[PDB]
Amino acid sequence: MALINPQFPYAGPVPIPGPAPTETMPLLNYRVEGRIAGIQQARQFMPFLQGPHREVAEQTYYAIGTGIQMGQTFNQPLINTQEG
Amino acid sequence: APATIAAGATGELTMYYWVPLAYSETDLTGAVLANVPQSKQRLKLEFAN
């Protein structure tokens, strides 16, 4: 967006020496076929386990029984003959 | 390395080299799959004399 100087104008570009025209043109680089080499193993001996863990520990229980329940020799009360 | 080993003295040297395969620790360009049991790798090292 330059302003044209009317007192000192200039013309378009003139030819100048050039950079040997084939040396600015590249070759198209020619890929050969390739292979991810080797026979891959199916599994890996991992350093960490792959499953979930638990944040807190919960107390577990198992039921037990008591035993054969016996009789008893109670201390027996007195007879309510109007004193009680 | 000691800067000067005198006449009759002994100097101890230590050097570390990083031989790169991947470009960086976040760019894996150049890394090698090595999960192949029958295909070995090889790291040839010539040392001084």
Distance in angstroms (rounded) separating the CA atoms of residues B39 and A39: 8
Please list, in sequence order, all residues whose beta carbon lies within 8 angstroms of the beta carbon of residue A40, skipping any fewer than 6 positions away: B33, B35, B36
Q: Does A46 touch chain B (CB under 8 A)?
A: no
Determine, for residues B38 and A37 on separate chains, whether the beta-carbon distance falls below 8 Å. Answer: no
| Chain A environment of B41 (Cβ under 8 Å) | none
DSSP secondary structure code for residue B29 in this structure: T
Up-side HSE of residue A70: CA atoms within 13 Å toward CB?
A: 3
The residue written with tokens 């040392």 in the block is: B47
Locate A16 and state its tokens: 């100048």
Locate A21 and state its tokens: 């025209």
Distance in angstroms (rounded) separating the CA atoms of residues A30 and A12: 41
Locate A34 and state its tokens: 């390739």
The residue written with tokens 């390395």 in the block is: B1
Nearest residue of chain B to residue A39 (CA atoms): B36
CB B35, CB A40: distance < 8 Å = yes
Query: For chain A, how far is it from start to end, CA to CA, in angstroms?
Result: 124
Determine, for residues B36 and A44 on separate chains, whether the beta-carbon distance falls below 8 Å. Answer: no
Residue type, B9: A
Q: How far from chain centre, in Å, is Cα B24?
A: 16
CB A42, CB B37: distance < 8 Å = no
Q: How far from chain centre, in Å, is Cα B23?
A: 16
| Chain A environment of B37 (Cβ under 8 Å) | 39, 41
What technique determined this structure? cryo-EM
